[PDB]
Amino acid sequence: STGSATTTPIDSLDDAYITPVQIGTPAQTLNLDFDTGSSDLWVFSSETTASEVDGQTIYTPSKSTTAKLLSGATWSISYGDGSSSSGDVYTDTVSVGGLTVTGQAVESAKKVSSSFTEDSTIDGLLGLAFSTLNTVSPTQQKTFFDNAKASLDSPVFTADLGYHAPGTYNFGFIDTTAYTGSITYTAVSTKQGFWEWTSTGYAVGSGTFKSTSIDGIADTGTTLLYLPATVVSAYWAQVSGAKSSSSVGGYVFPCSATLPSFTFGVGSARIVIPGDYIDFGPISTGSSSCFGGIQSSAGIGINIFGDVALKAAFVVFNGATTPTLGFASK
């Protein structure tokens, strides 16, 4: 089997992408944030504290004839950005772009962090990291991809995120028309539960490539590119007027400035992030100071290849027995 669904940015800055997901019988369609940095499928629901719902579409298990309470099961998660949520668990039918999993754990939110309430366009998350990170207790649950894997024509999914435009998630096949050149594959460590790999280095604009190992995660659920402070400093040094602002919480720059591209290495191959992708606009409405899309990972504890980097490539998440990652230009 295969599936294919369009993913759409939630706003003009590509802060995140939402993908429609059918849950239950009859189908309830929710717009979920596909997150390769986590492993819970959780949704706003009829069970969510009313004061914590503000515009989101909810899942109502009682209206689904295929929903079954997973008795005794609870879940609770906190994300790298200080967000969180918690609740109970049903199993139900979940379909993504034509691909159907029966018995998928659907985690029903009883409580969500303010940040989720405040984002009316995201109805929940669909985690695509490794199932070892799943928070359901006492019995850990599998991700949508893990459940679908054996049925898929090939045990892969691909992320093809757009710049200021929609993109595509595919399951079970590689669309050879979606990228240029070849796909370079690189090794993955699952030891932290992430799609963790090692970039071979970077260049800033037309600068010479610096060969150096950068360990990080491919995370569709994170907006920006977070890299070591040395790297980030080398980038912003090439932008006139840029500075790191503690009050703002990162590098900012005047929008009159031209942003250089940023190249990262995948084995011997090279992915170029155009400068325009690194502009995240005014820090506040009307400000002349713009927020940068490349920021320091210092004190995150891990480097994150977020949407800023991934949207510059066609990315293969290969769930073969030994997982790997593939990157192609497009």
UniProtKB/Swiss-Prot annotation:
Disulfide bonds: 255-290
EC number, as in UniProt: 3.4.23.22
The keyword RNA-binding appears for this protein: no
Top-level taxon of the source organism: Eukaryota
Location of the Peptidase A1 domain: 17-328
Active site: 35, 199
Keywords per UniProt: Aspartyl protease, Disulfide bond, Hydrolase, Protease, Signal, Zymogen
GO BP terms, alphabetized: proteolysis
Single GO MF annotation: aspartic-type endopeptidase activity
Catalysed reaction, written as an equation: Hydrolysis of proteins with specificity similar to that of pepsin A, prefers hydrophobic residues at P1 and P1', but does not cleave 14-Ala-|-Leu-15 in the B chain of insulin or Z-Glu-Tyr. Clots milk
Family under the similarity heading: Belongs to the peptidase A1 family.
Protein name: Endothiapepsin
Taxonomic lineage: Eukaryota, Fungi, Dikarya, Ascomycota, Pezizomycotina
Recorded name of the encoding gene: EAPA
Covered residues, full protein: 90 to 419 of 419
